[PDB]
Amino acid sequence: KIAYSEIITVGTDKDYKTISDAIEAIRHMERDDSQRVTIKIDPGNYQEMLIVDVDNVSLVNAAGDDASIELADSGVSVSDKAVRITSYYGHGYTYYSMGEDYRYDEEVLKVNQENGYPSVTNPGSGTATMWNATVYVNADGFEAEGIIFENSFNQYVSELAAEDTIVAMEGAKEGSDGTRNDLEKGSTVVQQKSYVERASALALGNNLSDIVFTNCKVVGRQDTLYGGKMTYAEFNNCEIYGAVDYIFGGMTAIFYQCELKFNTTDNKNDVGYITAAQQSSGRGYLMYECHITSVEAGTDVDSKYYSYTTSKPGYFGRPWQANTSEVVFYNTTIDECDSTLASTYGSSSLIQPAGWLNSLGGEAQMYEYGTTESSGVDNSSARIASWTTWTTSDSVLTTPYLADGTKITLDAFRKNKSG
Ligand SMILES: [Mg+2]
Ligand SMILES: [Mg+2]
Ligand SMILES: [Mg+2]
Ligand SMILES: [N+]
Ligand code: NA
Ligand code: NA
Ligand code: NA
């Protein structure tokens, strides 16, 4: 056991050299679980996977109010005032670096590369690996400020990925620019739809409380951000990036004044769906005064595959749990789509007129109140026109009240301490 420290630092001459090392130190502290530990991280690029299994821990950028969450170099780099926590496993591949707990281990890598075979087969999607999440939060009271969480699987070939041995397995998706193992460091060819599969940046476990992200960014494509059932999490002034089902799971979440950025390519089938909610009961997601928008070429993504001023139009979501899942879009501002893509895909709005799809789990309690369309269109009458049990008039609210009478407020989506 080591002493309690309320604040510990990460950086080349700080308390700890890696974020992993700092979390491991917290596991050894003589502290009550109620005593918070803040990990104050120097700006830098941290090629690490983390399991946060310690209560009341914060990850914060040492740059404070002057933190950046900007990407650079077509996704490959970050601002010098950014803290990026990144890793690269995704569905369909096994990795010589992967250890028994499904996380990267440099010592396992060395053994496996000497042996000529991996030691652990990647399950891929699902809760065994948390969709290969970079950061898996499995504790109460977790907070983060000014951090970029990323899975690079469909963003770029990282240093560590290029040095790993990556094995295509069941479900591997690849296009025509080389197999994943053969790509060199810095390649962005993995942004293409033909290489896309599920790879989470950030996953929250189930039954967790008091999780809050502030001024963070979460970077991925398919299944970027997961949160489990009965977890309360808030994302305040964050940026969430993705394509298919990029915010998913059964958490009771608030996205307060977030940028919701479609991270898609020119490929005609590369369409985004913001939410894929999976509640069996109770409250779902509250998207409160968010901005539906797009990534930018040269900072976030490679212009080779992103040729227009916006993403093509996408959708608010596709419910994963039938009937009982819940998402509320409240006071959303929706970009106008690039005029060329608007014509091609039949939508001036960056959200398709139908709004939602039944193509995952079915219909469920998907709501919209107070939309501003920057294009000036009014697609209210078109929303979910093909749905039969949750219909347009259930979804498109004229007053800010849900079907059970609940007023749409932040507090409606926070934990009720008496149960
Ligand atoms: Mg890779
Ligand atoms: Mg597949
Ligand atoms: Mg309305
Ligand atoms: N940026
Ligand atoms: Na860890
Ligand atoms: Na799987
Ligand atoms: Na790298």
Q: Where are the domains of the chain?
A: 1-200, 243-419
Q: Which two tokens stand for residue 273?
A: 């769906």
Read off φ and ψ for residue 304, nearest 5 degrees: -55, -30
Residues flanking ligand 4, CB < 6 Å: 70, 299
Sign of CA dihedral 112, 118, 124, 129: negative
Check whether 202 is labelled as a binding-site residue: no
Ligand 2 centre to CA of 359 (Å) is 17
Q: Which two tokens stand for residue 3?
A: 């002493």
Q: Which two tokens stand for residue 117?
A: 């075979």
SS3 string, the chain, reads CEECCCEEEECCCCCECCHHHHHHHHHCEECCCCCCEEEEECCEEEECCEEECCCCEEEEECCHHHCCCCEEHHHCEECCCCEEEEECCCCCEEECCECCCCCECHHHHHHHHHHCCCCCCCCCCCCCCCCCCCEEECCCCCEEECEEEEECCCCCCCHHHHHCCEEECCCCCCCCCCCHHHCCCCCCHHHCHHHCCCCCCEEECCCCCCEEEECCEEECCCCCEEECCCCEEEEECCEEEECCCCEEECCEEEEECCEEEECCCCCCCCCCEEEEECCCCCCCEEEECCEEEECCECCCECHHHCCCCCCCCEEEECCCCCCCCEEEEECCEECECCHHHHHHHCCCECECCCCECCCCCCCCEEEEECCEECCCCCCHHHCCCCCCCCCHHHHECCCCECCCCCECCCHHHCCCCCC
Check whether 197 is labelled as a binding-site residue: yes
The correct CATH number of 243-419 out of 3.90.550.10, 3.10.20.30, 2.160.20.10, 3.30.70.240 is 2.160.20.10
Residue found by looking up tokens 């059932």 in the block:
229
Check whether 171 is labelled as a binding-site residue: yes
Instruction: Check if the beta carbon of residue 38 is closer than 8 Å to that of residue 4.
Output: no
d(CA 206, CA 326): 17
Instruction: Identify the burial level of 321 via C-beta atoms within 10 angstroms of its C-beta, where 0-12 means exposed, 13-18 middle and 19 or more buried.
Output: buried
Ligand 6 centre to CA of 127 (Å) is 9
Ligand 1 centre to CA of 194 (Å) is 14
Residue found by looking up tokens 């959200």 in the block:
351
* All residues with CB under 5 Å from ion ligand 3: 369-370
d(CA 209, CA 415): 8
Residue type present at position 386: S
Catalytic residue among 55, 164, 245, 335: 245
Contacts of 411 (CB under 8 A, 6+ apart): none
Q: Which two tokens stand for residue 167?
A: 């094995």
Cβ neighbours around 115 below 10 Å, total: 10
* All residues with CB under 5 Å from ion ligand 7: 158-159
Instruction: Check if the beta carbon of residue 154 is closer than 8 Å to that of residue 90.
Output: yes
Instruction: Check if the beta carbon of residue 396 is closer than 8 Å to that of residue 380.
Output: yes
Instruction: Identify the burial level of 105 via C-beta atoms within 10 angstroms of its C-beta, where 0-12 means exposed, 13-18 middle and 19 or more buried.
Output: middle
- Ligand in nearest proximity to the CA of 178: 1
Ligand 3 centre to CA of 245 (Å) is 24
- The residue whose CA has the least distance to atom 1 of ligand 4 is 70
Query: Residue 202's beta-bridge partner residues?
Result: 135, 225
Distances (CA, A) of 348 to 4, 313, 334, 337, 406: 56, 8, 10, 5, 32
Ligand 7 centre to CA of 187 (Å) is 10
Q: Which two tokens stand for residue 346?
A: 């039949």
Instruction: Check if the beta carbon of residue 318 is closer than 8 Å to that of residue 276.
Output: yes
Resolution in A: 1.3
- Ligand in nearest proximity to the CA of 197: 2
21 in active site: no
Residue found by looking up tokens 């699902």 in the block:
126
d(CA 306, CA 295): 9
- Ligand in nearest proximity to the CA of 171: 2
d(CA 179, CA 174): 7
Q: Which two tokens stand for residue 169?
A: 């397995």
* All residues with CB under 5 Å from ion ligand 6: 124-126
d(CA 24, CA 183): 33
